[PDB]
Design a protein around this ligand. Structure first.
Ligand SMILES: *[C@@H]1O[C@H](CO)[C@@H](O[C@@H]2O[C@H](CO)[C@@H](O[C@@H]3O[C@H](CO)[C@@H](O)[C@H](O[C@H]4O[C@H](CO)[C@@H](O)[C@H](O)[C@@H]4O)[C@@H]3O)[C@H](O)[C@H]2NC(C)=O)[C@H](O)[C@H]1NC(C)=O
Ligand SMILES: *[C@@H]1O[C@H](CO)[C@@H](O[C@@H]2O[C@H](CO)[C@@H](O[C@@H]3O[C@H](CO)[C@@H](O)[C@H](O[C@H]4O[C@H](CO)[C@@H](O)[C@H](O)[C@@H]4O)[C@@H]3O)[C@H](O)[C@H]2NC(C)=O)[C@H](O)[C@H]1NC(C)=O
Ligand SMILES: O=C(N[C@@H](CCCCNC(=O)c1ccc(I)cc1)C(=O)O)N[C@@H](C[C@H]1CO1)C(=O)O
Ligand SMILES: O=C(N[C@@H](CCCCNC(=O)c1ccc(I)cc1)C(=O)O)N[C@@H](C[C@H]1CO1)C(=O)O
Ligand SMILES: *[C@@H]1O[C@H](CO)[C@@H](O[C@@H]2O[C@H](CO)[C@@H](O)[C@H](O)[C@H]2NC(C)=O)[C@H](O)[C@H]1NC(C)=O
Ligand SMILES: *[C@@H]1O[C@H](CO)[C@@H](O[C@@H]2O[C@H](CO)[C@@H](O)[C@H](O)[C@H]2NC(C)=O)[C@H](O)[C@H]1NC(C)=O
Ligand SMILES: *[C@@H]1O[C@H](CO)[C@@H](O[C@@H]2O[C@H](CO)[C@@H](O)[C@H](O)[C@H]2NC(C)=O)[C@H](O)[C@H]1NC(C)=O
Ligand SMILES: *[C@@H]1O[C@H](CO)[C@@H](O[C@@H]2O[C@H](CO)[C@@H](O)[C@H](O)[C@H]2NC(C)=O)[C@H](O)[C@H]1NC(C)=O
Ligand SMILES: *[C@@H]1O[C@H](CO)[C@@H](O[C@@H]2O[C@H](CO)[C@@H](O)[C@H](O)[C@H]2NC(C)=O)[C@H](O)[C@H]1NC(C)=O
Ligand SMILES: *[C@@H]1O[C@H](CO)[C@@H](O[C@@H]2O[C@H](CO)[C@@H](O)[C@H](O)[C@H]2NC(C)=O)[C@H](O)[C@H]1NC(C)=O
Ligand SMILES: *[C@@H]1O[C@H](CO)[C@@H](O)[C@H](O)[C@H]1NC(C)=O
Ligand SMILES: *[C@@H]1O[C@H](CO)[C@@H](O)[C@H](O)[C@H]1NC(C)=O
Ligand SMILES: *[C@@H]1O[C@H](CO)[C@@H](O)[C@H](O)[C@H]1NC(C)=O
Ligand SMILES: *[C@@H]1O[C@H](CO)[C@@H](O)[C@H](O)[C@H]1NC(C)=O
Ligand SMILES: *[C@@H]1O[C@H](CO)[C@@H](O)[C@H](O)[C@H]1NC(C)=O
Ligand SMILES: *[C@@H]1O[C@H](CO)[C@@H](O)[C@H](O)[C@H]1NC(C)=O
Ligand SMILES: [Ca+2]
Ligand SMILES: [Ca+2]
Ligand SMILES: [Cl-]
Ligand SMILES: [Cl-]
Ligand SMILES: [Zn+2]
Ligand SMILES: [Zn+2]
Ligand SMILES: [Zn+2]
Ligand SMILES: [Zn+2]
Lengths: 694, 694
């Protein structure tokens, strides 16, 4: 038989290992020749594997690179202007790669050029609450200062935005061993920790879903008319550079001014973590000077798009996508995911060669320039938005398959919760001690739901990866799954060698997944989801699961507002409409589920599959969220303080945030009521798409 | 058999006559009790006629009414401040109706209150080119003046916008006999001309598709959060009032200053048509003073929505809609159309009672508050936008069925051209001298296509009626058809008694259509279109007709740009991408048509019916046109100078308009190139929806 078990059994750990090795021998930085060569290889192999069509889709987008003959670095200067300490110009390369060419040195992509010199202020993780603490409580003014912030907790672009709004003239990001050095494990190459010379690369854009900064709304094709740089979307206005903890220690050890306000501001280095501004008495006249000379350049990128045409509903698309570009070798990010995608295509192709086709069309994508702001996936979605919004069933992302070896981690729309629970109950756990138990059992034991008991945690989607345009802009049901660590406070910080030259094939093969069994489990989860989505007669979405979460999110946002009872009385702020809509959604979803279970009629089926497919679409508001026109989903958006985190009822959440500090409370509460109306209306409208059609 | 001929034969002129009489005995002004009573009657009758469900959908929207105890009027005052002439407080009521209550006096809906006093300037039709002539050529400054403008040629809201931007402090609109008195015909009640005391009511909003001024984007339901008046959409900033030509003659006869610049500025009254400013020597110290005391008030409105559920595709909707609210008795506008809709519902219901159902669902709508800015249709479309954009096949409008008795007039999307040509070839002409000939033959003879020879004229859709939200915002294929006059220069001015108290049942029965044969022909065209759209196995749209017009529109916009060859060289302005897209659209549409003709498979059928249904949808840009977010169609929009007229490639047209007057030509031409890119991309994207799906 050609069924899901056939598909799953064809997947092999050994093939994933071979592909990972093949994908990680040289750097594949977006916009480079090496990455174009890999694109061509994948295109050729996907054709050999059996896909119906495999094309490259190219775009010309804004990228950012250091200047090869004018290196970025930071100094401490003395009052004579002698640079008495300089940060490193490169990460010491790992063993056996000290002769690889074209390793990009650590830099913050899209930083402007500048040579700002000033006094340092230390701002902890540079989160919104860290800046509130500095400015409001400690009365420290960051205006005209250079801020130094540790990586972790929130997306680095949010740190930079926060530092800009505080009036900083530059930002230095560093990896503290508190966040990137697990106790008791050795530094690379002898273990999986970050060495003192290691540095995390990464972009510092605040695009809010726009894609290429020069062409918001439209694909960056050959005739595109581009914004000038001064009008580009999301570029930072102050220079930014990342460093390792050996270098950070040199900059932090001389810091004076105020003590850290409490222990949550102290990392693990042997320094006081004084917030500053500036250095202690003896060194009071020394300054810090940045030298950033990176350039932004429009550069061609290439997505590989493979199609496996559906036998019955070829005009319904299930998309499996993940990126191919890496900062350096991409041992985990992204090639651990791309190797999984490659073995999934191979397996589907093996069934295709035996005469099988999926019910619906499956599209496979190898995206480019994810690391520079989701540019490849977003431009392709802009180009194909009409096809996607009328035909897109689901998108499953496939970046890093592993960031640890402890248990599964899943983020997806509520419409896929039942699917994930059901699939993981049929898969074998790879974990030690759970031999012969299901993955559902191990995952549920290790990652219990905070609400539900006997169920696993599944989190909300925000941004940070290539599903963003499909879910937040277009309203296509989306999901993602990987193996992760047991390190809860670090869930947005990255694994220690994240975006460093040390993330290599050897890292994975030696320290993460020697038997490629966690990779295989992730291939079964991702590929199993795609199989069911593309093959199930009735789409495997359960609208009742959305009804349950909408009530939870309504309770949560009401509870936030209720911290302000006097204002709710004064301005007549009622959540009654939103609860009414949620109640209606629950009732209508229950009735739809009954019809779906109780309806030979392919029109009724597809009419009801269209109702299922367009349900996520119904949560899109074509006017977008306030000042974020490309985040259009009313139930979820990437958090305004941390793009990696999803926020629920984001329009109301943002209207309430720090509301006690707004100068015109009537106006501020008016905008809360407006967002409650938009949210109640959208919930009711989505519910009504599940009513009988006529 | 239950086929189109059965449907058409059931329609009766006598029933349309009976319904028109029934609908026009009392005023039905939006927001009044009388109009709610008519809504309830229609709802009851549609149920008796056989519809599956008939509901009222209500909204609370901003309307505008004169103050019953503080009348609006205009004076000439002398230097002592004595009002020496006053305009009328009401139109003399027609015979037999001099005792009807609640006839609203002439007023401009949504005018602000004010009592501005000043010198008059006469601005012809107050078109963009009339103000260019005054200001640029004649060097007459309208700042702080009261402008007096004749109705005609363009929507009155555009006149007011133009007068505001010229700095006018008030506007007086009047009906000149040149435009509203056909030579050789008598004034009402003895003929169909406007008497000197007759006055055209009408709103002066510039909503650009927003619907209710207080709730743009969302339905004005019970929990809606409303903008404050100061932030409302589209309200005029200066007082405005309409008058008849007896009154206009008193205001114009004393005008001095400059002679009219040419004969196209002179109407038919016995006055010089001096442009002013102000009065000739003897009366130089007299002024004109307006007194406007109308109030804007949030008021409940009611749409009637009837459903006839489809037998095979109940989740595909064909909509027949027209409004019910009238300024006074609505003898032509709208009840000549509503009586036609009523007989169409009756006929469909007669087939339904015999066991027939259409293939697709048909929705019937009696809209409210059309006269106050399309408010009923727009709020309902905002409420139901998700259902409409995923299920809406087509919208056929049904306002006034007759505005003359000469020949057919049609405006529709190119997707319906073949349908209209084919249907009119099967209908009998009602015209004298064409007994036994087709309506296609008479219409083609009387209204020849300017391009095509042997074909009739069909015009582009703009705004001015309830199809606007469905077509311009949502991208649902739309059409409209009525009987019209032979008076080409008057095609946007209205028939003489338009929006006056004189448009009565007797007007129609005596002077327009005594045998109700033109009404019946229009019922056959509108109802025949709905029948074919709701019943044809393959949707009756021909994508090749869009390809033909896109080439014509591309040629036209290129020709406008080519009036500026030096700038096109300097700024490298190329239309090559747009022509390429049109060429691709033509090729792909040809191939799709071949597959459609050459494809027992209901999946392929519906897959191809979905391709047909979503083709109009593909021309929507979710970012809208510049500063007009609710006009989203890239090929068509209501003209920025005349909302009644459609404009093609409106984004490029507006970027080119008066470009030689812009102070920063680099920026102005940059924006032309941007609009060419958006247009070429959208054409190509629409074409790609017709490619094989996988
Ligand atoms: C959840 O679904 C329910 C349907 O099961 C839906 O209920 C609807 O609620 C609205 C708003 O409450 C009702 O609106 C009323 O409609 C009647 C006519 O049917 C009007 O007369 C009412 O207006 C009067 O009362 C108002 C409130 O006091 C006054 O402000 C107003 O000036 C009038 O005096 C009112 O508009 C509607 O009838 C029901 N529909 C039903 C029961 O079928 C509810 O709205 C849904 N929730 C959401 C968030 O959409
Ligand atoms: C109408 O449909 C046709 C397809 O039948 C479609 O043609 C496409 O045109 C684009 C743009 O001209 C082609 O883009 C080229 O793609 C190749 C790789 O295939 C690139 O190497 C080319 O880039 C080079 O040349 C450029 C121009 O001189 C340089 O600016 C650039 O720096 C490179 O040196 C170029 O991107 C594309 O291949 C075809 N596709 C085909 C033939 O299948 C056309 O775009 C459609 N029209 C519209 C308006 O969409
Ligand atoms: O690196 C990226 N993404 C990593 C981020 C790893 C650190 C934070 N982790 C999460 O956000 C996360 C991981 C897994 C799951 I299931 C859910 C969330 C990833 O998604 O694997 N994306 C790049 C590009 C910019 C768009 O974010 C970056 O963040 O620098
Ligand atoms: O009166 C309205 N519509 C009339 C307008 C009649 C004069 C101008 N005629 C056209 O625009 C027209 C008529 C028929 C056809 I087929 C196409 C265009 C109608 O559509 O019949 N609408 C109202 C409401 C505001 C939204 O325009 C008005 O214009 O005051
Ligand atoms: C990754 O695997 C690919 C595919 O096997 C290798 O590319 C092939 O290399 C052989 C030998 O040079 C050529 O004959 C083929 O034409 C290549 N096939 C392609 C590109 O589809 C590639 O050598 C491997 N890369 C590494 C680093 O091992
Ligand atoms: C840090 O690097 C800077 C820049 O290379 C060094 O300063 C330079 O030293 C050279 C050789 O002595 C001079 O010719 C340049 O003019 C200096 N440039 C600048 C910008 O100062 C500096 O010596 C280095 N500091 C340390 C401690 O290694
Ligand atoms: C997950 O599996 C459960 C258990 O099999 C599925 O729920 C059953 O579905 C069938 C078919 O509709 C019903 O007859 C049973 O009553 C259901 N059992 C329940 C609700 O306990 C569920 O459909 C699956 N979820 C998917 C496929 O998304
Ligand atoms: C328009 O026609 C309607 C429907 O025939 C008339 O309303 C009916 O009037 C009779 C007699 O008063 C009542 O018994 C019915 O209940 C009404 N039916 C409805 C409202 O559905 C109405 O009288 C006519 N109007 C005019 C001006 O002639
Ligand atoms: C035009 O109407 C105005 C307003 O009614 C008339 O002026 C009023 O005349 C009455 C009675 O003589 C006075 O008591 C009011 O104070 C006047 N009001 C104003 C605002 O002036 C005026 O007489 C009328 N003119 C003509 C020619 O009929
Ligand atoms: C309008 O009528 C024409 C003439 O009947 C239709 O065109 C024919 O359609 C049939 C069925 O596809 C073809 O086999 C013929 O070759 C067509 N004749 C032509 C193109 O000259 C046309 O489809 C009708 N338009 C509609 C229904 O929208
Ligand atoms: C990089 O720097 C070198 C000199 O250090 C300079 O000549 C060149 O302009 C720069 N390259 C850029 C800005 O792309
Ligand atoms: C911070 O310092 C800048 C620079 O002098 C000044 O303009 C700003 O007002 C200061 N703000 C606060 C809150 O002290
Ligand atoms: C793999 O799991 C083991 C056993 O718990 C653990 O000691 C090791 O550190 C894990 N590797 C990684 C990278 O987490
Ligand atoms: C209408 O005018 C009368 C007096 O002329 C006044 O008392 C009332 O306030 C007005 N009505 C309004 C503004 O609705
Ligand atoms: C028109 O008159 C006003 C009022 O004095 C003045 O401000 C404006 O500049 C004038 N414009 C022209 C073009 O004469
Ligand atoms: C009806 O048609 C006749 C004959 O051409 C014409 O004289 C008459 O004026 C028409 N009525 C209207 C309202 O146009
Ligand atoms: Ca873009
Ligand atoms: Ca509204
Ligand atoms: Cl992922
Ligand atoms: Cl109409
Ligand atoms: Zn990645
Ligand atoms: Zn990454
Ligand atoms: Zn009308
Ligand atoms: Zn009207």
């Amino acid at each position: 038989k050609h069924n899901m078990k056939a598909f799953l059994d064809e997947l092999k750990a050994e093939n994933i290992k071979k592909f990972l090795y093949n994908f990680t021998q040289i750097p594949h930085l977006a916009g480079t020749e090496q990455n174009f060569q890999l694109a061509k290889q994948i295109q050729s192999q996907w054709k050999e594997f059996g896909l119906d069509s495999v094309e490259l889709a190219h775009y010309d987008v804004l990228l950012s690179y250091p200047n090869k003959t004018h290196p970025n670095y930071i100094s401490i200067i003395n009052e004579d202007g002698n640079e008495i300490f300089n940060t490193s110009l490169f990460e010491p390369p790992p063993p056996g790669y000290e002769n690889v060419s074209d390793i990009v040195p650590p830099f913050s992509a899209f930083s402007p050029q500048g040579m700002p010199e000033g006094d340092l202020v230390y701002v902890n993780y540079a989160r919104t609450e860290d800046f509130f603490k500095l400015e409001r409580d400690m009365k420290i003014n960051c205006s005209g200062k250079i801020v130094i912030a540790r990586y972790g907790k929130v997306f680095r672009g949010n740190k930079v935005k926060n530092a800009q709004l505080a009036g900083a003239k530059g930002v230095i990001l560093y990896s503290d061993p508190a966040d990137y050095f697990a106790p008791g494990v050795k530094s690379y190459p002898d273990g999986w920790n970050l060495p003192g010379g290691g540095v995390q690369r990464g972009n510092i854009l605040n695009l809010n879903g726009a894609g290429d900064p020069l062409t918001p709304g439209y694909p960056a094709n050959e005739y595109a008319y581009r914004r000038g740089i001064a009008e580009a979307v999301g570029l930072p206005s102050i220079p930014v550079h990342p460093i390792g903890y050996y270098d950070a220690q040199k900059l932090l050890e001389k810091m004076g001014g105020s003590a850290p306000p409490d222990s949550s501001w102290r990392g693990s280095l042997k320094v006081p973590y004084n917030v500053g501004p500036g250095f202690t008495g003896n060194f009071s006249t020394q300054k810090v000077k940045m030298h950033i000379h990176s350039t932004n350049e429009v550069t061609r990128i290439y997505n590989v798009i493979g199609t496996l045409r559906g036998a019955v509903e070829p005009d319904r698309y299930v998309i499996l996508g993940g990126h191919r570009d890496s900062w350096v070798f991409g041992g985990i990010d992204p090639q651990s995911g791309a190797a999984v995608v490659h073995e999934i295509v191979r397996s589907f192709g093996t069934l295709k060669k035996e005469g099988w086709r999926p019910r619906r069309t499956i599209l496979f994508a190898s995206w480019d320039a994810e690391e520079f702001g989701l540019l490849g996936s977003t431009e392709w979605a802009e180009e194909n938005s009409r096809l996607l919004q009328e035909r897109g069933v689901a998108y499953i992302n496939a970046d890093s398959s592993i960031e640890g070896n402890y248990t599964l981690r899943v983020d997806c729309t509520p419409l896929m919760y039942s699917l994930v629970h059901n699939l993981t109950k049929e898969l074998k756990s790879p974990d030690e001690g759970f031999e012969g138990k299901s993955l559902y059992e191990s995952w549920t034991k290790k990652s219990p739901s905070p609400e539900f008991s006997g169920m696993p945690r599944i989190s909300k989607l925000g941004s940070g990866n290539d599903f963003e345009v499909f879910f937040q802009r277009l309203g296509i049901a989306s999901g993602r799954a990987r193996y992760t660590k047991n390190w809860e406070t670090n869930k947005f910080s990255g694994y220690p060698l994240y975006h460093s030259v040390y993330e290599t094939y050897e890292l994975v093969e030696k320290f993460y997944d020697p038997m490629f069994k966690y990779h295989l489990t992730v291939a079964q989860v991702r590929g199993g989801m795609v199989f069911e989505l593309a093959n199930s007669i009735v789409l495997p979405f359960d609208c009742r699961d959305y009804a349950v979460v909408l009530r939870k999110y309504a309770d949560k946002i009401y509870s936030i507002s209720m911290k302000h009872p006097q204002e709710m009385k004064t301005y007549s702020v009622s959540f009654d409409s939103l609860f009414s809509a949620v109640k209606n959604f629950t009732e209508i979803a229950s009735k739809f589920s009954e019809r779906l279970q109780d309806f030979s009629n392919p029109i009724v089926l597809r009419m009801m599959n269209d109702q299922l497919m367009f349900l996520e679409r119904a949560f899109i508001d074509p006017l977008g969220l306030p000042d974020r026109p490309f985040y259009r989903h009313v139930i979820y958006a990437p958090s305004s303080h941390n793009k990696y985190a999803g926020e629920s009822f984001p329009g109301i959440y943002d209207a309430l945030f720090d509301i006690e500090s707004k100068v015109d409370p009537s106006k501020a509460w008016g905008e809360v009521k407006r967002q409650i109306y938009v949210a109640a209306f959208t919930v009711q409208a989505a519910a009504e798409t599940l009513s009988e059609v006529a």
